Amino acid sequence: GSMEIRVRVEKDPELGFSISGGVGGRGNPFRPDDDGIFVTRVQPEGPASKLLQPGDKIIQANGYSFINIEHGQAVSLLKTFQNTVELIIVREVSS
């Protein structure tokens, strides 16, 4: 199934994860059909350690919607924020 999760990540000075996807982006390693923004790698001793995992779909960040967001806009937002970033993600969970 799926679930939404709030995730706070404190930049130090990066978030410590990578993303792929977005409208106008090249897709993602997880779902062919989805234009969403997906977490693809998490630095193991970085700020997102234990909080995010590859395959998490970002649908909001500091109150900005990431649903069908363009690739460049998502990168710009995440890179522009400072200090704390409050994410909402959709995580797939084992049946």
Partner: peptide, 5 residues
């Protein structure tokens, strides 16, 4: 290419 943030 993924993008580190």
């Amino acid at each position: 290419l993924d993008v580190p943030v």
